């Protein structure tokens, strides 16, 4: 369908210079996505084989921002993403043809990187799902395509028990996705300066130090819900005094139950 | 239509039932005691009537039930219920003049004296020991194709084999061949039969439980 | 009972001779007798009783005798049985299990059942034209009447709706004695608990149940059937 | 149940239990009241037999007598102390089981 | 493991070579070999590496693979498995986790595992009733032999039952030496300290230590693996 030609991840986004407080994890999952392609000879010459990937799970929070970092900071050619919602569809059995055509396009792209999104939509009879994941681990364990290929499993619920017991073979680094900090959000706002026309009267420090418990999704609702709440009245200028109720309401009315 | 094969001393019933059953058997239908796990709830009336109904539809049929002492003990009410179904469908209201079943066991003590009634289990033959007749005969038929050195002496192989079985001596002789197979010699000297059959035979004496 | 054998008696076997009576008495008795009772199969003991009392032909046909890919042979079969019924002897047609040919269906993918029920409407118009000077006696019974079409149970076609949920204790003694009198009986064969319990539990075709007990006595090992095959034939079938 | 007067009198004379119940919880009054054995029920009531034995379904012998339209067993048992209030699992009264106005003389013989 | 991996590697290599006397004098090679023992030994990746050393075509297959959402497919996968194995050249196929279906439970009411283990009985039909079984063999391994099928006493069935005698640091150092006998290894390995640090560890845990060596290899900057990277990974992940 349209997801085949639309599967390419064009239109780069959040870069590395605007990371959301990630200090150690950004290296733990960066040294496998950015450095192995920059220095392939060190991994093949120094030891057994280059690392494959890491594991990301837990609360959503600032999810998909680090994958946006991988898309933006790509050196030569942006990689291809894979979502889980394209597998569970009508006329079951198409998952084998889909994984064979994305493996065919992956080998057409000299064995580039593959990003798996929402593995819990198909994980958790699932014999065709076992065919997809066992064809993934089976066709990817072979050194024939490449050794620098990287997978990335992102999920919200750890209820995928079968992938959790099949992952220790190839995958590793079972760690939480990312914890949010307090000082890094001003860079998410600095890259949100390329968003819609925020009036220059707003100060990023005043909007930054007046909102605790401001995880990446919640500040995404600060800029997103702030802008759209400024489109409620279809206004033209967006001053912080106009949507301050949207700010303290989007942090407090949402911080009531959570 | 039934038979009871109790061989508490030594083995050899598998070589016989598997010998003729491997020869023709007129059919194949094997019931191994390991494939009846049955961890679900149960609607097995049409299942036992399904298998026995297949034995009624097919005119020739031979059923083997090896190691029945574990499923025939004298969480037990359902086992005794399935055995009641076995009684009611083995001596039920159907003619079984053509079907034949064979039940093998290990010890003739917990063999359900309600099942020991004739009809279900008519014939019974005890296997005490593999006498020298079938021992030297099975050694000659197992030593036929495999050639040996010109120095032939069966008195040492028969003499050093004391308190063994047909399958045990089979695995000891074939294990000796799988021990001389390492030196890829075409001719097979009998000294390696004394060495390998002696050591492996001692492993069978220590592991003869 | 006492009304079932009397109404079927005088409405079935009394007009089965001297055909001029149908118009000598005026209003011809209705030939439509619809039996009921879904516990057992049934619908056999009375067909045998008529098959032995009355000395005439009986062309029985399963309700799916013409359900095929073709449409013919319907009016050929029923027309031949009609012409031999009014020609040689008024044979009683036994059409059992009309629910297979009386099921509602609106889709046109299964136009075979709708086509043969349109043929059923054709012969319905035939029996509409067969109410004056005709020798025809067709018994039509079934086990479920909730799904039957209203055009079949319309007055003037099926005017007798006899219900048979359970026979009385005297009819139990007769229905057991009429089958145990010929088969091997003994003192253990008793009709007291077998007149008490089968009167509590709903069960039809008692004669067929005793025939199943004959299938439990077909081993020839025990020459006389006992209570074990009776109660076992009760709990099983 | 076989309407054997001398066999019943001689069995009950030796020390038989009238209230003895089978596996179906039915006594001899269910069968004697089911086959129309009036005099058998009467000679059973000579030996002080109970008339309110519940069956496996809960029906009393009065339900089995009135079920077969036994007017003499209904008038006898009700006229001797049969309890019409005891119901079965189906929740059916002896008046509703019998038809043809027999429940009217049942309740008439209960109140009177 | 030389006393057991020598007989294993021989028992999986010589059948492809010794066909001469196998057809001239009718010697029956071991068809069923049970590579059981305590877990963590790495029998799956060691048998996969040795199967890759046999040069024959390898096909992956697991124990619970016979259990499907539908019924009657196990006969298609076993008869089809011996159809590709029957028609194709003599190859090597290694499975694992056989004890899950080789359990003789005492309950006897009903289950679908009765039908799955009945397909297993069809596999035993195709390993016992077929005298031309000198073709492709079926190697099976189990992680526990607490409940084993007593009817596995046959040369064609699981006969080579080799237990793992308390796999101390020597066994882990040797399976790690075979799993990493080809890539860049430092030319100073006594195995005494690096193997002695491995206490009650698994095969995937030692190879996970090797993966950790590949993880700090990026931040070491050297041109070849070192000696302290083994204990660095052992003390790193575990």
From Swiss-Prot, chain B:
Entry GO terms, CC: cytosol; cytosolic proteasome complex; extracellular exosome; inclusion body; membrane; nucleoplasm; nucleus; proteasome accessory complex
Positions annotated to bind ATP: 7-14
UniProt-recorded Gene Ontology molecular function terms: ATP binding; ATP hydrolysis activity; identical protein binding; proteasome-activating activity; protein-macromolecule adaptor activity
Any one GO BP annotation for this protein: positive regulation of proteasomal protein catabolic process
Keyword Lipid metabolism: no
Keywords, in A-Z order: Acetylation, ATP-binding, Cytoplasm, Nucleotide-binding, Nucleus, Phosphoprotein, Proteasome
Modified residues (N6-acetyllysine): 39
Location(s) in or outside the cell: Cytoplasm; Nucleus
Function as written in the Swiss-Prot or TrEMBL entry: Component of the 26S proteasome, a multiprotein complex involved in the ATP-dependent degradation of ubiquitinated proteins. This complex plays a key role in the maintenance of protein homeostasis by removing misfolded or damaged proteins, which could impair cellular functions, and by removing proteins whose functions are no longer required. Therefore, the proteasome participates in numerous cellular processes, including cell cycle progression, apoptosis, or DNA damage repair.
Quaternary context: Component of the 19S proteasome regulatory particle complex. The 26S proteasome consists of a 20S core particle (CP) and two 19S regulatory subunits (RP). The regulatory particle is made of a lid composed of 9 subunits, a base containing 6 ATPases including PSMC6 and few additional components. Interacts with PAAF1.
UniProtKB/Swiss-Prot annotation, chain C:
Biological process terms in GO annotation: blastocyst development; proteasome-mediated ubiquitin-dependent protein catabolic process; proteolysis
Organism domain of life: Eukaryota
Described purpose of this protein according to its UniProt entry: Component of the 26S proteasome, a multiprotein complex involved in the ATP-dependent degradation of ubiquitinated proteins. This complex plays a key role in the maintenance of protein homeostasis by removing misfolded or damaged proteins, which could impair cellular functions, and by removing proteins whose functions are no longer required. Therefore, the proteasome participates in numerous cellular processes, including cell cycle progression, apoptosis, or DNA damage repair.
Family: Belongs to the AAA ATPase family.
Organism this protein belongs to: Homo sapiens (Human)
UniProt modified residues of type N6-acetyllysine: 228, 232
Sequence positions that bind ATP: 37-44
Keyword Mitochondrion on entry: no
GO cellular component, one term: cytosol
Signal peptide feature range: none
Keywords of this entry: Acetylation, ATP-binding, Cytoplasm, Nucleotide-binding, Nucleus, Phosphoprotein, Proteasome
Gene Ontology MF annotations: ATP binding; ATP hydrolysis activity; proteasome-activating activity
The encoding gene: PSMC4
Subunit structure comment from the entry: Component of the 19S proteasome regulatory particle complex. The 26S proteasome consists of a 20S core particle (CP) and two 19S regulatory subunits (RP). The regulatory particle is made of a lid composed of 9 subunits, a base containing 6 ATPases including PSMC4 and few additional components. Interacts with NR1I3. Interacts with PAAF1. Interacts with TRIM5. Interacts with ZFAND1.
Cellular compartments annotated: Cytoplasm; Nucleus
UniProtKB/Swiss-Prot annotation, chain D:
Subunit note: Part of transient complex containing PSMD10, PSMC4, PSMC5 and PAAF1 formed during the assembly of the 26S proteasome. Stays associated throughout the assembly of the PA700/19S RC and is released upon association with the 20S core. Interacts with PSMC4. Interacts with RB1. Interacts with CDK4. Interacts with MDM2. Interacts with RELA. Associates with a CDK4:CCND2 serine/threonine kinase complex. Interacts with ARHGDIA and increases the interaction between ARHGDIA and RHOA, hence promotes ARHGDIA inactivation of RHOA and ROCK.
ANK repeats: 1-21, 22-54, 55-87, 88-112
Species for this entry: Homo sapiens (Human)
Subcellular locations according to the entry: Cytoplasm; Nucleus
Described function: Acts as a chaperone during the assembly of the 26S proteasome, specifically of the PA700/19S regulatory complex (RC). In the initial step of the base subcomplex assembly is part of an intermediate PSMD10:PSMC4:PSMC5:PAAF1 module which probably assembles with a PSMD5:PSMC2:PSMC1:PSMD2 module. Independently of the proteasome, regulates EGF-induced AKT activation through inhibition of the RHOA/ROCK/PTEN pathway, leading to prolonged AKT activation. Plays an important role in RAS-induced tumorigenesis.
Tissues where the protein occurs: Tends to be up-regulated in cancer cells with RAS mutations, including lung cancers and adenocarconimas (at protein level).
Region described as Interaction with RB1: spans on this chain: 57-112
Swiss-Prot record, chain E:
Record carries keyword Lipoprotein: no
Modified residues (Phosphoserine): 186
Assigned keywords, A-Z: Acetylation, ATP-binding, Cataract, Cytoplasm, Deafness, Host-virus interaction, Intellectual disability, Neuropathy, Nucleotide-binding, Nucleus, Phosphoprotein, Proteasome, Ubl conjugation
Compartments reported by the entry: Cytoplasm; Nucleus
PTM info: Sumoylated by UBE2I in response to MEKK1-mediated stimuli.
GO cellular component: cytosol; extracellular region; ficolin-1-rich granule lumen; membrane; nucleoplasm; nucleus; P-body; proteasome accessory complex
Reported disease: Deafness, cataract, impaired intellectual development, and polyneuropathy: An autosomal recessive disease characterized by early onset of deafness, cataract, severe developmental delay, and severely impaired intellectual development. Patients later develop polyneuropathy of the lower extremities, associated with depigmentation of the hair in that area.
Similarity comment: Belongs to the AAA ATPase family.
Protein name: 26S proteasome regulatory subunit 6A
Species this protein is from: Homo sapiens (Human)
Protein's gene: PSMC3
């Amino acid at each position: 369908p349209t997801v085949t030609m639309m599967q390419v991840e064009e239109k780069p986004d959040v870069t590395y210079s605007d990371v959301g407080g990630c200090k150690e994890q950004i290296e733990k999952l960066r040294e496998v996505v950015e450095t192995p392609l920059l220095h392939p000879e060190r991994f093949v010459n120094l030891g057994i084989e280059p690392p494959k990937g890491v594991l990301l799970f837990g609360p959503p929070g600032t999810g998909k921002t680090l994958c946006a970092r991988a898309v933006a900071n790509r050196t030569d050619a942006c990689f291809i993403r894979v979502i889980g919602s394209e597998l569970v569809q009508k006329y079951v059995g198409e998952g084998a043809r889909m994984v064979r055509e994305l493996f065919e396009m992956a080998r057409t792209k000299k064995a580039c990187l593959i990003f798996f999104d929402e593995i819990d939509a198909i994980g958790g009879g699932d014999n065709e799902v076992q065919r997809t994941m066992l064809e993934l681990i089976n066709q990817l364990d072979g050194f024939d395509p490449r050794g620098n290929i990287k997978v990335l499993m992102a999920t919200n619920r750890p209820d995928t028990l079968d992938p959790a017991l099949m992952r220790p073979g190839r995958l590793d680094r079972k760690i939480e996705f990312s914890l949010p900090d307090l000082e890094g959000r001003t860079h998410i706002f600095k890259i949100h300066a390329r968003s819609m026309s925020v009036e220059r009267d707003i100060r990023f420090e005043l909007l930054a130090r007046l909102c605790p418990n401001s995880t990446g999704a919640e500040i995404r609702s600060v800029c997103t819900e702030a802008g759209m709440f400024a489109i409620r009245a279809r206004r033209k200028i967006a001053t912080e005094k106009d949507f301050l109720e949207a700010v303290n309401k989007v942090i407090k009315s949402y911080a009531k139950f959570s | 239509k039934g038979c009871l094969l109790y061989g508490p001393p030594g083995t050899g019933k598998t070589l016989l039932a598997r010998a003729v059953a491997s020869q023709l058997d007129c059919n194949f239908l094997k019931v191994v005691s390991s494939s009846i796990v049955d961890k679900y709830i149960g609607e097995s009336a049409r299942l036992i009537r399904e298998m026995f109904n297949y034995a009624r539809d097919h005119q020739p049929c031979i059923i083997f039930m090896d190691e029945i002492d574990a499923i025939g003990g004298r969480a037990d009410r359902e086992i005794q219920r399935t055995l009641m179904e076995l009684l009611n469908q083995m001596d039920g209201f159907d003619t079984l003049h053509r079907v034949k079943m064979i039940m093998a066991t290990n010890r003739p003590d917990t063999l359900d004296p309600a099942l020991l009634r004739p009809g279900r289990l008519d014939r019974k033959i005890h296997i005490d020991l593999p006498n020298e007749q079938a021992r030297l005969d099975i050694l000659k038929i197992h030593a036929g194709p495999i050639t040996k050195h010109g120095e032939i002496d069966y008195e040492a192989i028969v003499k050093l084999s004391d308190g063994f079985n047909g399958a045990d001596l089979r695995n000891v002789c074939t294990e000796a061949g799988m021990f001389a197979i390492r030196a890829d010699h075409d001719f097979v000297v009998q000294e390696d039969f004394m060495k390998a059959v002696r050591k492996v035979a001692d492993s069978k004496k220590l592991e003869s439980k | 009972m006492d009304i079932q054998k009397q109404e079927v008696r005088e409405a079935v076997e009394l007009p089965l001779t001297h055909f001029e009576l149908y118009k000598q008495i005026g209003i011809d008795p209705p030939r439509g007798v619809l039996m009921y009772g879904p516990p057992g199969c049934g619908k056999t003991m009375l067909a045998k009783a008529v098959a032995h009392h009355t000395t005439a032909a009986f062309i029985r046909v399963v309700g799916s005798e013409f359900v095929q890919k073709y449409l013919g042979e319907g009016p050929r079969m029923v027309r031949d049985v009609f012409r031999l019924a009014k020609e040689n002897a008024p044979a009683i047609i036994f059409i059992d299990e009309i629910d297979a040919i009386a099921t509602k269906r609106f889709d046109a993918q299964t136009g075979a059942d709708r086509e043969v029920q349109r043929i059923l409407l054709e012969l319905l118009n035939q029996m509409d034209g067969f109410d004056q000077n005709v020798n025809v006696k067709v018994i039509m019974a079934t086990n479920r009447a909730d799904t039957l079409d209203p055009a079949l149970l319309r007055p003037g076609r099926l005017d007798r709706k006899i219900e048979f949920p359970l026979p009385d204790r005297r009819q139990k003694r007769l229905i057991f004695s009429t089958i145990t009198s010929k088969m091997n009986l003994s003192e253990e064969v008793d009709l007291e608990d077998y007149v008490a319990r089968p009167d509590k539990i709903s069960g039809a075709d008692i004669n067929s149940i005793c025939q199943e007990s004959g299938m439990l006595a077909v081993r020839e090992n025990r020459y006389i059937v006992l209570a074990k095959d009776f109660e076992k034939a009760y709990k099983t079938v | 149940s076989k309407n054997r007067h001398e066999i019943a009198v001689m069995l009950l004379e030796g020390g038989a239990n009238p209230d003895a119940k089978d596996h179906y919880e039915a006594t001899a009054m269910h069968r004697a009241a089911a086959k129309g054995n009036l005099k058998m029920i009467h000679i059973l009531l000579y030996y002080k037999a109970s008339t309110n034995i519940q069956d496996t379904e809960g029906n009393t012998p009065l339900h089995l007598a009135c079920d077969e339209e036994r007017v003499e067993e209904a008038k006898l048992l009700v006229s001797q102390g049969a309890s019409i209030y005891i119901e079965n699992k189906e929740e059916k009264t002896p008046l509703q089981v019998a038809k043809g106005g027999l429940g009217l003389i049942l309740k008439r013989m209960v109140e009177g | 493991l030389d006393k057991q991996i020598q007989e294993l590697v021989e028992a999986i290599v010589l059948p492809m070579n010794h066909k001469e006397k196998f057809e001239n004098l009718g010697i029956q090679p071991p068809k069923g070999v049970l590579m059981y023992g305590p877990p963590g030994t790495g029998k799956t990746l060691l048998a996969r590496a040795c199967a890759a050393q046999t040069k024959a075509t390898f096909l992956k297959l697991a124990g619970p693979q016979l259990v499907q959402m539908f019924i009657g497919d196990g006969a298609k996968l076993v008869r089809d498995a011996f159809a590709l194995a029957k028609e194709k050249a003599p190859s090597i196929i290694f499975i694992d986790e056989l004890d899950a279906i080789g359990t003789k439970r005492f309950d006897s009411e009903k289950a679908g595992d009765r039908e799955v283990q009945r397909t297993m009985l069809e596999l035993l039909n195709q390993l016992d009733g077929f005298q031309p079984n000198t073709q492709v063999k079926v190697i099976a391994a189990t992680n526990r032999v607490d409940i084993l099928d007593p009817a596995l006493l046959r040369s064609g069935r699981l006969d080579r039952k080799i237990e793992f005698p308390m796999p101390n640091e020597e066994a882990r150092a040797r399976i790690m030496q075979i799993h990493s006998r080809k890539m860049n290894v430092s030319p100073d390995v006594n195995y005494e300290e690096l193997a002695r640090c491995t206490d009650d560890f698994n095969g995937a845990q030692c190879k996970a230590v090797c993966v950790e060596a590949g993880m700090i290899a990026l931040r070491r900057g050297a041109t070849e693996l070192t000696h302290e990277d083994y204990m660095e990974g052992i003390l790193e992940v575990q």
